[model samples]
Each structure stands twice: as C-alpha cells, then as structure tokens.
Target: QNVGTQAAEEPLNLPISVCTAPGNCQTEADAVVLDSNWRWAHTTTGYTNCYTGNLWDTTLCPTPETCTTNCAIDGVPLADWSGTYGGSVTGNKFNLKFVTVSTNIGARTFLLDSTKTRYRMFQLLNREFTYDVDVSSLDCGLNGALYFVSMDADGGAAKYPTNKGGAKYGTGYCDAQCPHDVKWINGLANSKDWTPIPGDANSGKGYYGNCCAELDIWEANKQSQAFTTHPCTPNDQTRCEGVVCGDNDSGDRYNGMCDKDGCDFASYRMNDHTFYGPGSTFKLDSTKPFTVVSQFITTDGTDNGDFKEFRRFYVQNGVRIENSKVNFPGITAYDSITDEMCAATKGLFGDLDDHKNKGGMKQMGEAMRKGMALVMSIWDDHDVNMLWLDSNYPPTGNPSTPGVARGPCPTTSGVPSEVEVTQANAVVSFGNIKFGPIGSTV
Candidate 1:
C-alpha cells in the first residue's frame, strides 16, 4: 500500500539498555511504532476511508490488487500515540491501555532501533532478557503480552516492491498462531477475501495468514501468567494461504505452518495455584510490579550451539524467586522448558505434538540466531473469550482434568463484550528492558 503524508511520522522515544556485565550497561535512545493495522487506510488522492469498521470500500478495493494500489496507510502523528491509541512513554516505561477513544480497542507496538529506520533485533540464544511489568490493573479477559517474532527488519519493503511503508509503518508481523487478521501480507492487501467477524464490527480475517517462530516472554494479567516458545518450520516471515495457513475455523490446525498449542509453563496450569496471584501471600504477587528474567541455554554454551532449554526467574521485594516447578502427574518435576518436558506435557494434555513436529527447540534457536523483533501489545480474545488462557477451556471439561483448568476464572467470565465495557480502564506498564549474559541482567 502507498504511504500517506497526512500526518508527520515521529516515533515515540523509549530508552532501553544493553549490558555486557552486571552494572556495565549503556542506554540507547530506542523508539516504538504502532502496527500498520492500526493506521488509517484511506484513498490515495483523497481523505475518504478505504477501510471502515472491518469492511473495505467496494469502489476503492473491488479487488485485492486494486486495493493494494488505491489505498494508503497514513502516518501517525506523535500526539496520536496517546490520544488515539492509548499508548505513551514516561522515562523508560511504556504504557498501553485498553479501550481507547471509545472504539480503539487495543494496540500492538514494535521496538525500533536507535536509528528509528528499522526494527531492533534481539538474539536471545545463550543470553538473558529482563523487563519490568505491571499488570495490577488488568483482568482475566485482557492479555498484556511482550514477545519476539522473526520479522524482517525492513518489513519486506525491500523484498516486496509494493511495500513503500516498511518498518517505519510497523509492518511485517507474524506469530505462532498464523494470524489471518493482519490486513496486509507480503506487501499486498488481503481486502478481497476479508470476512468480518460476527458481533465484532472492528476486525475480520483474510485468506492469507502470516506465520513465524514466536518466543512468548510474557502473556499475563493479575490472575495468571505464562511464558512459552512456539517453533515453526522455516521459522521466519512466511505468507500462507488455504489449508497451508491452518485455518482454525476450517478445523485444520495440525497441518499449518506454525504450532498453535505451544509448550507453556503457566504455574497455575501446572497445579501450582498458590505460586502467582494478586495477594502478597502468593510466591510472586501480581498486584505489584516485578522483574522477570528468562535465559536461553544452548547445547554448546555458545550462540552457535543448538537450543537445549529455557529457564525463568523473577525478582520481587528484593528477593530472587525461581520459577515454580511442574506439579502435574506424568510431567516430571521441572521448572524450565526442555524437549523432554514438552513431550511429556503434550502427551499428558492429549494435545498434538506440534512443537516437536515443527522442529522444536533447535528450530526455535535458529530463528533466534537469525534475530527477532520485539512486540508488545494488549488485546482481548474474540473466540472462546480467552478461556484457553485464564479459565477452564472446553467449557464442559472437568476441572479435575490435567489441561482443562488453566486459572481461577469461571468459564463464563472474560467475554469480549463484557470486558470491553467493564474493564475499559485497564492498562499495562512494561519497561526497563535489558539484554545481557545469562546471569548479568538478573
């Protein structure tokens, strides 16, 4: 799509630190950019909206190729960062709010390098990533996510000639879920095949889906939290169509390009209900801010080595807390994720072993070696109302079942229509991002 000059583009400055050793770090003037999906799509020669409330204008976008040529994704003025998107930065903290401007539902942001011309890439193998998060005000239905995906630094602008707005427009997003909601894919509009979501007027799915490896460092709320790694074959930005896209609506999830049910380590899901919660009595309380550290361990003790395991820890109230070990049957008493652990968990959960079939940890490490772009967002699930995350999934499944009970929330809670109005004031604060050696950041 064309790049519109209506609003002057200016990225929000957010300072981050890179470290070589403890107390040995330097701050960089990094920045953040909102996803192109949030940008207004208008006619190239006029201000008329080309896409409105999940529907494309038939005159401007009668065909996908024509929509690709006639519509332009406009730039976002710096002030609109907060005024329209409910996003802002203070000191090193980045805040993203839910239900902004009455209709602006949520936001997805990418970290830009100091140059502000491309995305900031992070190589996590054999290293540690630490960040401070505040989900005190969030609820069960809302997800405050901070993760990494293998997206092109140029957002496929150089590779695809049609894309004039690259990283600067926060383009090129993919994940383990192989999302078809992205309006643009491979520098082309997915408008012709758009199917509006029922009851949700602001979003819909397209024919093509974007897929890539995803490292979920944090997906949380005050009630529960989880960290996971979803590996995929050709673990990079890939455009898929039809069955290759693994359309969940078509009941074809296993043959997709990416793994849907990643190997997760949610303490509550592992039968450690007292581990993390809102009260101080919990091992790692969620009502207050805390520092989270995740380490990527390789087989050969070097960045070139194959990925072996993942470790997690937390620092709160001046105390270091190790991740809670798995407490379920059939699963061994381990706190971190490994190939063996993943196998056991998947078998016990009766889930398809997609993580292993998709090349598992080794493939995930390779993606990290190639580099990944960081992503932060706040969203409410439209399907299943986020039951898979913080409540008993399947709705009718027995809570006594191994994978059925995920959190304390009731099955009927977390409806999008309900949370959007009841929890409209919810906000999440994430900042103090640091990357360094395995033990340096913590």
Candidate 2:
C-alpha cells in the first residue's frame, strides 16, 4: 500500500496500489473477516473457517467473539494489520486498504468503534492502530483525517464532547473523556519518505508534535469515581483515595496534587507525548499510503502500583516511547521510567496549565489505564490557523505567506463557515488493524 511515494497530480489524482512481491503480508487466506457493527473492515472482507464447504463466511457475523460487547478481543479480533488495511480491493487489485471518498467538503466524518462496548485508550499502550491512506486527490484546503477519539454522550442541548479540549480536561471537551489527533500537509506524511516502522520523534516536524502524531489525554478516571473537591491538595478531602492514581505520600496525599480547595473532571496537560498544536510533523506522500498504529501495555509493578493496580507503555507504529521522556518525575519520588511518567502526568492533569507551564506536560499514565474506543474522523479547521495546508481558499483566492484576507473560498454550505476545506472529494482509507488482546506484563 503506497510503498513507493509520489503523486503526479492529475485530474482525479489517481491512487496507486503495489504490494511487495511476497513479504510482510500473508498469502493464503485462512482466517475470516469480522462485521461492520463490530469492526469496520471485517464487513468488507469476511471469510469462514477453512472448510464450511468452502463457503464465504457470513456465518461469522453476530458471533459473540466479534459481537459481544466488553468481550476480551484477544482471540476475537484478527491479529495482522497488513492483512486488513490493504487498499483498493474495490473491484480492483494489489491494494490492501479500505477507501472512503468525500465528493463535497462540508467535512466528511466516518466513525469507527471496536464493539464500543469497552474500547478504552488506556488499553492501547503496547498495541497499535496502523492504516494506509491516499490523499493525492484531496484539494489543498480540503483535509483528509485519520485519528483516534473517545466519545462520551453529554446530556441536553448543551451536549459537549468528552474528547477535544486540551488541558482543561472535562471542562473543555466535556465533563468526561477525549481525542488524540494529528495532521499532514498533503496526501502523505512529512519530509522523510514515509516508512512503516519509522523512528519515533517526540515533537514538532518529528513524529510527536505539531501537525504530527499528537496524544492528548484528558478524559479518564478509573470508573464511577468522581471528585468531591477538585484542585485537590494533598489533604484536600481524602477524595482521590479510591481513585487510584499514583501512591500518595506519607499522609495519604498525592504529591503536587492541588494546593487549596476543589474541582472535578479537572485535567492538566500531560507531557511531550502530550503534544502541542499539531504536536509532531512528518511529511507524508500525497500519493502513497501509510499506517497509524498505537499500542498500550500495563506492566503490573512498574510504578509499584500493586498486582491488580499497574503501570503502562504508550506505543505507536511498533515502537513504544518512554512516558516520561520530556518531563521530569512528579510529586512523589520514584524509580526510573514508569514511575516518573505517571507522577508527572498526575501533576499535569491536576494542574491543567493551558500551555503556560514550561517543563510540564499532559502525562498519560492514567489515560494509559482506562478502557476507551478508537474513533477516527475527517474535518476542516477553517484555514485561518493555516496549521492545515491552506495557501488560499480556492480558485480566486491569492497567496501570500499565510493569507486569509482573500475572500472566503468555498464554504461547505451546510457546515459552519469556519470550515477549512472548500472543495469536495476528500478521502482517506483505514484498515490493516491488528489489535492484540489486553494483557499485562507479569
């Protein structure tokens, strides 16, 4: 799927499909596909157990393995990413991806959920969500997106999203959970020829910051636990007690917690992994395809959190980054890696500093522990920021360093005028998703 990078830029901006002569991907088809309600691609490529009279496996549908909510997907979901996200398959060939195209650009949003029953972000430290994309044809101002988000249903007309706000946590996005997204200029990744298992960079033009792979965690708390007095200080109210974050100090209070009184759903910014504005930037080939893979693993005693209580790893593609690489340790002093990571994150979420704290970050130790849904969507950011690739709006708009002074390009009539994309036909395909069962390091 887009091994050779390039986009000739023609009428339709053709999508290319070429698989390695015989590598990475398997040849013979033995496993069957899942269903749409369960996983997106399984509906496109369904197969049966080797025999069953050589019949195509539609029988696998509605099965508990793929259908049951909260069922541990270990033996349930398929294991190979390359096998699923392969492109073209559109009554075509050589492509291992599932494509979705948007003819008009009011903002094309396609939602994907794994059983949604119990998909949590904290569960993905060591596993990854990788996919190939073709955006060569996407008009400059039009954006094609591939990212993950946690959705929480807010009540009434003021329905706010649980995933979006930065460090404000529940207040910004919602009073609940959230999103970790990234963007690329063209139909491809940043500068370097997009590689499968690319090296992991932590911020700006690298793999972890600014228009790159950004992980913003603000919506997670063990379940059912809410704060009585937020902005929680060490002795605030014994509220954080059963919450189970890091080990509280001598007086049973978390270090660097809140100093004064209270609040709830309060979340501070995590750390370097917790990106800022487009977090990381990688040049993507507008014509070729690439995958977005993520992994999270819980190592039982990494932070001395106890047997049932544990620590975790945050991974992307195939590599896992140290949760505390950019920032230092938190309130309570601890060992090397994991401990530092969780403590620092606790401080960030508890502080909710709005890009003001220098050496601080939105630590993900807690986010890495909760169960969440993997959500993907595509929408425009109203070019004004130009964070997205916006030379001018459309045909008539002139260009300058970053000018919006030109008249409005093509507003996606139905959507808000702030939409960045003016044209239609913006698309991206996602597949080859390999999700391992949720297991912890013994």
Candidate 3:
C-alpha cells in the first residue's frame, strides 16, 4: 500500500486582513475566556484619551475616585450659587447621581443623564446594584447624577495591601505601613507583627517588640473585623495578605507577597517523564496528519539546569512509525489590562482525503490529546506558566530550531478536499497564586 502524503498546502488567493492594536481587547464578557489566548500587542488612543470598547488599563487608575456629592431626586447634584457643591458628606442620605471620569483625559468628568445614559457604580460595603439616577427632571442639566453598584471585595483580594511596616507605601507586604485593612501584611519584618528595632523597647530594653498595631486597627475596623477573626490559623493570614506565609517553624521560606513560597502552585510545568520522558508507553500514528491542540513551557528557577522536554510522533496506519518532532512555541506572559495569564501556540496543518471515516477521526482525536498533554507537561515544569491551543489543522512538520531557519513541508499531490470540522477547540489558562514574602514558589 502506498502511504499518502498527509501534509497539506497553503490555500491560495485567500484575502486576509491583518490589524493590530497596542493592548488586548475582548469581545467576550467573560474574563476567563480572554485568559485562554495569548494577547501580544494592543491599541492606544494617545495620552489622556479614554479607551473605547472593553479594553481597560489597570495601571491607568486602579483606585477610581467616587463622586462624593449627592444629587436631588431629579438626579442633579445639589450645587451652591457657584455651580459647585464641593463634596458631599459621608453617611448623609440623599438622592444619588452617577458620573464617569476618565483620568487619562485630565480627569475629565461626565455626568450621566439617566433618561439617555446608562451609568453604573460599585458600592464598597453592601454590593447593592443600583442604576443611574433619573435625569429626566434635571433636563440633562450640568448636575449629572452619580450611580452606585455593589462592590465585591472578593475580586480585589490579590491587589489589596499587606504588611504594616515599611518605607514603601501602597498595598502588599513592604517596608511601609499599610493604610487600609483590605491590604495584606506578613508577620515578619516589614510585616504585620512587631518589628525589631536596633535598640530595646523598655531600655528601650529590646531592640524590637511585637506590636500588632495594624492588626489592632483591622480588628477594630468593622469592615475587616469579620474576616480577620473568623479563621484562627497562621496560614489563615494568607487569605488576608493574598500570600502564603510559612508556619512558625518553617521560618519565612515562603511567606512574602509575590514570592515563590507565598503561592502553593509551582511556576513551572511538571514533566514526570512518563509519556515524553521515561516510562512512557504512548505510540504515534503516521497515516494521517497529526496536529497539536495545546502546548506549554516553564522555568524551575535554575540558572541553566532546569529544563523540561516534550515530543509528538506520527505512525503510519498505527503500525509503522513515520516521523516525530519536538515543539517549543515560546511563552506568553501576563497582561495587566486584560488580566490574561497564559500563552498560546499558532500554526497550520492539513491533509488530502475525499472520504471521512471513523478511524481517521479517532486518530485525529488521539493526536489532539497528545498535543494537549505536551503543553501541560511543559507548564508543570515551570512556575507561573500555562498553554492555549487552537486545533484548526494538524502540524505539517517539526517546528524550526530556536532562532534558526527551516524549510516548509512539501504540499501533497491530489485533488483538494474540504472536510467540515468543529470550530470549537480547548484551552488552558493560569494566573499568579500568592502565599507569602520572598517565599513565593510559583
């Protein structure tokens, strides 16, 4: 039997448009969906210009200032003769107004007309969902109403500040003291516990004393008291700090924010050497073209010794092995704007066949699984890594060497065939998991 060439040729005369932006944007409302693909470049609307569409920049203004003034029942802010109400007093009940502010545009504020504009805001305490105040009575006046929506602190856990003593300010464990209870803090130096001074406290007798001042404030604050007092374990601190601090005996090996020890998951993909390494029993099919649906890579913190490998092979008609190859598609790091935390592989593959058979489909499925496994193995060996695969077709040949030139697969000689395949594929995503201090593991 003559073995048919499985590698397909690139379609000709296909009109394709290539466009790029400065930042990643998502057509889907689900952030999880966006995290599956690698977002390289994005588009920007110049400095001080608000970005249209779903794309957002966290660094631009993470902590948005709330409109403090209250509006009348007509959704108009109660202004003085000067047309400015200054700021509203806290706890003072009045009709609400919602407005949108763009920090990039010199903090240009826009009032929402409830009759024409749909505005939304997040409430910090009760997460009560509320719409923009009715602006019909205000006749779309200057006192645009401010809207409030329920805020979920749960989503902000990773960003909250920790540690109460440090020269640096803002959230997370640092030398500066945290200004907010929602922040995270370790127990060690620059942490929440008592810091050691060069001299004593009473004799100033002891150089450092354990003064849980920040914790005291948190314990007293109504907002944080509920979360802090509930779980009574040292590891429980991880929930507050968003980083895993080691137990008392473990020292600080893994306790700082963003440190390897703080997070439980390993940064690298785990390759047990079962399928691609040692003791693997998997075999390859070579009769049909095989394509990779997913792939991954990771780093183990070793200078040069930490490296993992994966391989895929093609066997002809499940009896004779034809070819095999190694794949390394590089990594797609994190994007702060989209909050996407994974990398993805992109390639093309195809074959020529007039008839669709169950055996051929089964072979395709198996190949897809193998490709996915290879991606996972690489991620397991490295820390903070993930993979996303789009199996539109099969691999024509082995990938090119790192920074080296390679030839493309030869096209098959036959009538071009079209086979309908499911457009839906699979994807794997990952994000940063923090535990504590320089102890961050992955």
What are the Cα lDDT values of the candidates? 0.89, 0.24, 0.16
User: What TM-score, to 2 decimals, does candidate 2 have?
Assistant: 0.32
Q: Which of candidates 1 and 2 is the stronger one according to TM-score?
A: 1
For candidate 3, what is the lDDT? 0.16
Q: Which ranges of candidate 1 are over 4 A from the true structure?
A: none
- Residue 330 lDDT (model 3): 45
lDDT of 2 at 127: 40
- Estimate the TM-score of every prediction: 0.98, 0.32, 0.17
**RMSD of candidate 3 to the true fold?**
27.1
User: What would the per-residue lDDT of candidate 1 be over residues 322-344, giving only the tens digit for each residue?
Assistant: 99988975568989989888889
Q: Could you give me the TM-score of model 3 versus the true structure? A: 0.17
Candidate 2 Cα outliers beyond 4 Å, as residue runs: 1-122, 153-284, 295-362, 383-385, 388-422, 437-442
- Best lDDT among the predictions, by candidate number: 1
Which candidate, 1 or 2, has the higher lDDT? 1
